[PDB]
Ligand SMILES: [Ca+2]
């Protein structure tokens with residue numbers, strides 16, 4: 001788990017590769033960043049792990065992806081952030097857990113984000129509730 | 132997004148299907164449950180969406196998967212929970228976001244959980260930190 | 263030597279020459295600027311040299327390049343500074359260094375700032391971290 | 394920018410290649426070294442990147458080359474640093490800067506350090522003041 | 525260099541390879557561990573290097589090998605630590621030492637820990653005094 | 656373990672045998688020396704064993720080899736320690752440890768110090784940090 005590049009595919013027609021390049025490590029918190037030429041609409045992805053005192057392990061993923069549009073004022077073109085989207089995955093394993101257990105766990109909740117899993121998709125994508 | 136069945140694949144040799152069946156809806160919070168015959172090691176998955184007052188949408192996914200082993204006491208065999216694993220995904224979109232934006236977003240962070248994405252896997256699965 | 267002109271090159275397709283002319287030297291800090299007739303948003307380059315109490319020679323270079331665009335207000339077109347880029351090299355030599363050592367030194371640090379010097383460029387130009 | 398070899402040239406008659414090799418990364422600071430084995434004789438190159446609190450991007454280069462005469466006696470060597478030279482380039486960009494802009498900036502100040510660029514040379518190499 | 529794998533050998537009939545993998549590096553203290561999927565009673569090996577204010581290089585190695593056996597409680601088999609063995613080598617070199625000196629040094633101290641090196645073995649292994 | 660000769664090898668092209676001979680025992684600390692006659696030039700190996708108050712068993716090794724250039728003038732020699740190197744291995748076992756266990760422990764950390772074991776070598780010999 002050496003801070004390194006992280007590539008994430010999106011759900012575009014023909015999936016694009018978003019390449020997040022490491023930036024730094026503060027307080028045992030890695031940060032990788034997909035940056036376009038201008039470092040303002042840069043999307044950041046952080047990751048961290050810490051072992052609790054009560055014998056547990058807690059991982060924390062954060063992904064931030066802002067949207068930029070060019071705002072024109074008195075002829076002055078300036079790229080700005082019009083809105084941002086945030087997500088935060090939080091794991092909590094028991095210090096006594098086995099690798100397989102953890103793997104399967106991830107795998108499952110991962111498979112839940114899938115686009116065909118209607119129950120969740122119709123919520124985290126199309127903003128519907130449950131009924 | 133009608134409360135309904137939710138099937139999640141795990142990362143086993145030849146992936147197993149875990150079928151969570153709806154249980155109820157409390158305060159606009161759905162709950163589906165993969166239950167073995169005995170309702171004690173039942174794994175629960177909850178989902179919810181709420182529109183903030185400040186014009187945002189926040190989804191919240193929770194997956195809980197306990198592990199059960201048979202504890203024998205004075206000849207009395209009893210299945211019990213020896214440890215549990217928890218995860219909590221939290222989305223936060225801007226009320227002005229477009230479907231595509233949201234979709235891609237999900238898709239990306241989803242693709243991050245993937246098993247081959249070393250940066251995160253070596254952390255949320257093998258409990259390594261970053262360096 | 264005497265405060266005189268200073269020409270710096272671009273990294274533009276066909277490198278443009280930026281001609282800086284003397285402006286003034288205050289407190290033994292030479293300033294030379296590249297500007298059109300107007301004293302606004304002119305790119306400035308300052309140079310200085312001082313001997314330290316501890317017996318060291320220490321000189322300083324500072325280049326400042328503001329980006330100016332035309333801001334139209336009620337038909338009143340005025341050029342204005344949209345943003346600026348700063349850099350400050352600091353040389354500190356030993357009073358016993360030979361011309362060659364010093365020259366070679368500069369030459370190196372110089373070479374380091376370069377289109378192809380990967381390690382460096384990717385950071386001072388692409389603002390990407392080291393890992 | 395993964396920590397890797399960085400090679401800088403002299404201004405020696407027939408430019409000598411100084412190959413610095415990665416030593417390590419510490420608190421988000423890369424270090425590459427042109428070493429011989431003994432640490433005090435090591436010429437070291439440093440590099441870092443930070444996103445300032447107030448939204449700017451700064452990166453820092455630092456080169457150090459010590460001069461060291463090694464007295465030999467009956468086969469036993471005694472290295473001694475007799476003088477050292479230091480440089481510290483400090484870039485500071487605006488979060489709205491273009492890749493192109495930055496690049497050009499660098500290239501300009503780069504061009505400033507240079508045998509023929511008189512104004513500068515006579516000072517950062519010949520240690521003459523400005524008048 | 526970079527925190528990577530580390531394999532250590534037994535002194536068992538047919539020496540077994542103990543493969544330690546990276547876990548994390550906190551406060552510039554690399555840790556690499558040999559463990560099964562579970563984070564308990566894993567043998568840990570840490571390594572670090574620091575430069576002293578007085579101008580010395582000092583690195584530290586620490587190997588910890590807990591002995592784990594299966595503790596059956598009411599049919600609930602759990603692996604647990606019965607006892608642990610600790611060791612801490614401390615190297616302190618002079619900033620003017622040459623690669624050879626240092627290497628040779630290690631090699632010696634190394635040789636000292638050895639099956640046949642009587643004086644030493646009988647004490648660090650048989651816990652018998654010197655007389 | 657009766658205080659006796661201890662011979663350690665180099666990592667020199669053709670391994671040189673360093674024969675330390677017993678000097679003495681002081682307050683339960685054995686000392687063996689590779690001497691030439693003059694005490695400051697002596698490379699000395701220390702060794703001890705204690706049963707900690709709280710029932711543990713600790714033994715300690717310490718090796719020291721000074722580098723000393725001896726200036727000769729008209730037949731009169733002037734030795735001078737120009738730099739020294741120190742190591743301190745610290746074992747700590749459990750009163751319930753097996754001979755076998757201990758032995759293996761030693762052999763493992765022993766194996767750690769070693770030309771090919773990269774992670775370690777690059778640090779305890781090449782003085783590189785961990786990243
Ligand atoms: Ca319904």
Ligand SMILES: [Ca+2]
Nearest residue numbers: 003262393786
């Ligand atoms: Ca790293």
